[PDB]
Amino acid sequence: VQGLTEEQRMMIRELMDAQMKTFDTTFSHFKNFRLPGVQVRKDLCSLKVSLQLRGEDGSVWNYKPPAKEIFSLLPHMADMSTYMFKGIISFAKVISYFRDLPIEDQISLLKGAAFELCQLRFNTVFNAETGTWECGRLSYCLEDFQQLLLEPMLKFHYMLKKLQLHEEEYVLMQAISLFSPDRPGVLQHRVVDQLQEQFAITLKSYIECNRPQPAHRFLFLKIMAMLTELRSINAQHTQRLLRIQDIHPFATPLMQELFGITGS
Ligand SMILES: CCCOCCN(C(=O)CCl)c1c(CC)cccc1CC
């Protein structure tokens, strides 16, 4: 199924192939991470998360948080973030359009979008019926209403999930986010921008060709608005993270590079 030009079909295929090669959807290789042991507030969410690890032998470990000092959870969160960031970096470097950019713009684009592409991937393993991100043998369950939807990042995941996007549309959202001409430090602003417009046109065109239903009217514009919201959620989270890092260091080396922390 198409309706697109051959160059548009190639673009989707190139993105789908990079996603296939760099997204471990069963989180098989996320191993030996840390776990909670046996203006700091006021800017953090009131959302609590419970953790579940299914054992290879069928046993289950379950973690419930106190019922809110979440410092015990940060090293684990830093390790999962780092694992997702590694996937995102591998995603970008397999795309020809990305490789073709100057090294400095690659770093600048990855610094801008790594959070955003990570969330887009986490949305594909989110279960909106049970409030759970299902990451292989690892589950993150939301702790007990619609008061949960007032945390903007949770609302993003629920709203994005309700759109019932195809694999192809998730991977085009990832490309539009990554090829953002107005990220800090971008030099080839015009090249990145024309790439972005092509990915966007392909998405608009894909939607027009393969989603005739009345429920998918304005779907392209809905997706664009969620990408705008994701970008704003990105700035909010970066600043929450740098505040905590200033009181309680937790960012991995890789997170430090992405957030421009230098070690001094
Ligand atoms: C430094 C922790 C940020 O976590 C808040 C953002 N988030 C989610 O909403 C789940 Cl998609 C998420 C979680 C919480 C389950 C764990 C690992 C990775 C991430 C994304 C990077």
Domain coordinates of the chain in residue numbers? Answer: 1-264
Helix runs in the chain, H state only: 6-22, 74-94, 96-99, 103-124, 152-162, 167-178, 189-210, 219-247, 253-259
Q: Are 207 and 219 in contact (CB under 8 A)?
A: yes
Ligand 1 binding pocket mutation candidate from 122, 133, 234 (most atoms within 8 A of CB): 122
Residue 122 annotated as lining a ligand binding site: yes
Atom 14 of ligand 1, residue of closest alpha carbon = 77
Q: What is the atom index within ligand 1 of the atom nearest the CA of 250? A: 1
Q: Which residue has the tokens 């809110």?
A: 68
Cβ-count burial of 54 within 10 angstroms (0-12 exposed, 13-18 middle, 19+ buried)?
A: middle
Closest CA to 5 of 167, 176, 183, 205: 205
Residue 237 annotated as lining a ligand binding site: yes
Note the Cα 120 to chain centre separation in Å.
4
Q: What is the atom index within ligand 1 of the atom nearest the CA of 126? A: 11
Ligand 1: centre distance to CA 188 (Å):
31
Q: Are 48 and 143 in contact (CB under 8 A)?
A: yes
What is the DSSP pairing of strand 138-142 with strand 126-127? unpaired
Rounded Cα–Cα distance for residues 208 and 217 (Å): 9
Contacts of 249 (CB under 8 A, 6+ apart): none
What are the tokens at 34?
């840390």
Note the Cα 197 to chain centre separation in Å.
21
Q: What is the atom index within ligand 1 of the atom nearest the CA of 115? A: 21
Residue 59 annotated as lining a ligand binding site: no
Cα angle value 214/220/223 (rounded, 5°): 115
Closest CA to 226 of 131, 127, 160: 160
Closest CA to 210 of 1, 63, 9: 1
Helix runs in 41-137, H state only: 74-94, 96-99, 103-124
Rounded Cα–Cα distance for residues 87 and 20 (Å): 11
Which residues contact ligand 1 via a Cβ below 6 A? 49, 77-78, 80-81, 84, 118-119, 122, 133, 140, 153
What are the tokens at 175?
């490309």
Rounded Cα–Cα distance for residues 55 and 73 (Å): 20
Ligand 1: centre distance to CA 221 (Å):
26
Q: Kindly provide the resolution of this structure in angstroms, with one decimal.
A: 2.5
Q: Are 234 and 250 in contact (CB under 8 A)?
A: no
Specify which residues 50 forms β-bridges with. Answer: 141
Q: Which amino acid is it at 224?
A: M
Closest CA to 97 of 165, 43, 18: 18
What are the tokens at 165?
């996007």
Cα angle value 49/52/57 (rounded, 5°): 175
